[PDB]
Amino acid sequence: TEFKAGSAKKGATLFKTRCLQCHTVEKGGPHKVGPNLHGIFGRHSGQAEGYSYTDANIKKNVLWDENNMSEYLTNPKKYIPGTKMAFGGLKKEKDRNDLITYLKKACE
Amino acid sequence: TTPLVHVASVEKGRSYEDFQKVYNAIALKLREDDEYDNYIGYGPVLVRLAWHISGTWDKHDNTGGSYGGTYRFKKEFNDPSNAGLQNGFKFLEPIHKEFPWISSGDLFSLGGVTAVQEMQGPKIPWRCGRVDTPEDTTPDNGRLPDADKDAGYVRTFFQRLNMNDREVVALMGAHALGKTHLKNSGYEGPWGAANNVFTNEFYLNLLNEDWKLEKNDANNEQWDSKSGYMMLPTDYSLIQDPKYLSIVKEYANDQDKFFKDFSKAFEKLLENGITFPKDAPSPFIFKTLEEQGL
Numbered sequence: 341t342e343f344k345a346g347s348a349k350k351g352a353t354l355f356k357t358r359c360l361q362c363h364t365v366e367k368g369g370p371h372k373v374g375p376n377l378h379g380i381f382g383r384h385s386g387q388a389e390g391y392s393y394t395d396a397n398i399k400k401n402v403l404w405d406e407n408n409m410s411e412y413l414t415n416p417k418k419y420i421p422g423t424k425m426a427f428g429g430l431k432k433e434k435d436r437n438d439l440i441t442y443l444k445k446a447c448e
Numbered sequence: 449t450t451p452l453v454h455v456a457s458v459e460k461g462r463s464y465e466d467f468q469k470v471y472n473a474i475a476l477k478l479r480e481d482d483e484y485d486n487y488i489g490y491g492p493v494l495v496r497l498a499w500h501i502s503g504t505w506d507k508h509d510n511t512g513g514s515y516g517g518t519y520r521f522k523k524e525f526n527d528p529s530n531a532g533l534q535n536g537f538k539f540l541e542p543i544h545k546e547f548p549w550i551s552s553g554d555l556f557s558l559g560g561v562t563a564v565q566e567m568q569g570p571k572i573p574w575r576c577g578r579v580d581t582p583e584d585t586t587p588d589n590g591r592l593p594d595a596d597k598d599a600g601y602v603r604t605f606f607q608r609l610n611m612n613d614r615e616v617v618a619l620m621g622a623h624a625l626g627k628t629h630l631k632n633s634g635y636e637g638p639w640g641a642a643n644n645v646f647t648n649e650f651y652l653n654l655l656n657e658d659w660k661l662e663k664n665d666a667n668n669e670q671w672d673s674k675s676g677y678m679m680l681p682t683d684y685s686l687i688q689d690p691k692y693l694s695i696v697k698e699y700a701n702d703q704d705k706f707f708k709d710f711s712k713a714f715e716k717l718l719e720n721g722i723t724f725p726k727d728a729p730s731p732f733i734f735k736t737l738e739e740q741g742l
C-alpha cells in the first residue's frame with residue numbers, strides 16, 4: 341500500500357510503551373482512558389460501544405484503514421481537532437509502520 | 449551590604465533569531481532521541497532540570513537561582529536531589545558546542561521552555577542575559593525540596609522562592625510529566641497516563657482517583673491509585689490543605705487558567721534573582737516546530 345508494512349515485534353513494544361497506558365486491543369478488552377481498540381480497522385471512528393467519545397471523534401466518521409490511521413497517529417489533534425486523546429504523535433514512519441502492522445494483527 | 453546584584457547581560461549582539469535557533473536545535477533533538485526512558489522522551493527531564501537550577505534561589509540573600517549556571521560544577525551537579533538530571537545535562541552538551549556563546553544558565557532554562565512548548569504546554573515568555581559565575585557561587589546542596597513532607601513544609605519551602613499558594617499549585621501541575629524512577633529517588637511510577645503531553649491531568653487524577661498509601665521497594669511510602677499511578681506525599685498534601693484544594697479544583701476544571709498561571713509562575717521561577725536593566729529586550733516568545741511547518 342502507500343503505507344509500507346513492518347516489524348510487528350517492534351510495533352508491539354511501541355504500543356506497550358506508547359498506547360497501552362490508555363488502550364487495550366484484546367476482544368471484550370476494557371475501555372481505559374481510551375476505547376478498546378478491538379476490531380478498529382474496518383470500523384468508523386467513534387463506534388466502540390459503551391465508551392464516551394468527544395463529538396469530534398464521532399462527527400469525523402472515517403473508516404479506519406491503515407492509511408487514514410497513519411495520518412492520525414502522526415498528529416491526533418490536527419487530524420481530529422477537539423479530539424481528547426493526549427498523544428504527541430509518531431513522527432517516524434517506521435514507528436508508524438511497525439505499530440500499525442502490530443495493530444493490524446492485534447485488533448483482528 | 450544588601451544582597452548580591454545579578455544584572456542580566458545580553459550575549460554580545462545576539463537577538464531573538466539567534467535564540468530561536470537554539471530552541472530549534474533543542475526542539476528537534478527532542479523529536480530525534482524519542483526513545484529515552486521507554487519513549488517518554490527528554491521532555492520531563494529537561495523541565496525538571498530547568499526547575500532545579502532555579503530552585504536553589506534564596507530570596508533573603510539572593511544566592512542560587514538560574515543566573516550563574518552553577519549546576520555545571522560538581523558540587524551542584526552531584527547534589528543527591530539532583531539525581532537523574534545528568535541525563536538532561538548530556539542531552540544539551542552537544543547543542544552547547546554548537547552555540548558556545550549562550551551561557552549555561554540561559555541554556556538550562558531555554559531548555560525547559562522548549563520542552564513545555566514542544567509538549568503542547570502554553571507559551572512561556574523567556575529572557576536572556578544570565579551570566580556564568582565562578583565555581584565559588586555554587587550553592588551548597590540541600591536547597592531543594594523533600595518529597596516526604598506535607599502541605600505545611602511546602603507552603604514554607606516556597607516562601608523562600610517568593611511564591612504564593614496559587615503559584616505553588618500551578619507549578620506542581622508540571623507533575624503531569626514524566627514519572628518517578630526508584631533508582632533516582634526512592635519513588636516509582638508516573639502521575640498519569642499522558643506523561644509527555646502537558647495538560648491538567650495532574651489535578652483530575654489527584655481528585656478523581658482513589659489513593660491508598662503504600663510502600664515501594666525502596667521502602668518509602670507513596671499513594672498508589674488502582675489505575676497504576678502514584679502521588680508523592682507532597683502532591684497528596686495539596687488536597688489535604690483546604691486552601692491548596694480549592695486551587696486544585698479550579699485547575700481540574702479549567703485548563704486555560706492552569707495554562708495561564710503556570711506560564712506566569714514558570715517564568716517567574718526562571719527569572720528570580722536577576723535584575724534586567726531598563727534597556728534589555730522584552731521577553732521573547734519562541735515558535736514551535738509545528739508552527740514552523742515541522
Ligand code: HEM
Nearest residue numbers: 358359362373374385386387393394397423424425641642
Ligand atoms: C500510539 C499510541 C496510540 C494509539 C495507536 C491510539 C489509538 C487510538 C484510535 C485509533 C482512536 C480512535 C478510536 C475510535 O475512533 O473508536 C483513539 C482514540 C482515543 N485514544 Fe488513543 N491511541 C494511542 C495513544 C493514546 C494515549 C497515550 C491516550 C491517553 C493518554 C489515548 C486515549 C485516547 C482517547 C481518550 C481516545 C478518544 C478521543 C476522543 O474521544 O476524542 N490514546 N486512540
Ligand code: HEM
Nearest residue numbers: 492493496499532593594595619622626627628629632633
Ligand atoms: C515540593 C516540591 C517538589 C518535590 C518534592 C518534587 C519531587 C519530585 C521527584 C521526587 C521526582 C522524581 C525524580 C526521579 O525519579 O527522577 C520529580 C520529578 C519531576 N518533577 Fe517534581 N518535585 C517538586 C516540584 C516540582 C516543580 C515545581 C516542577 C516544575 C516546574 C517539577 C517538575 C518535575 C518533573 C517534570 C518531573 C519528571 C522528571 C522525569 O520524568 O525525569 N517538580 N519531582
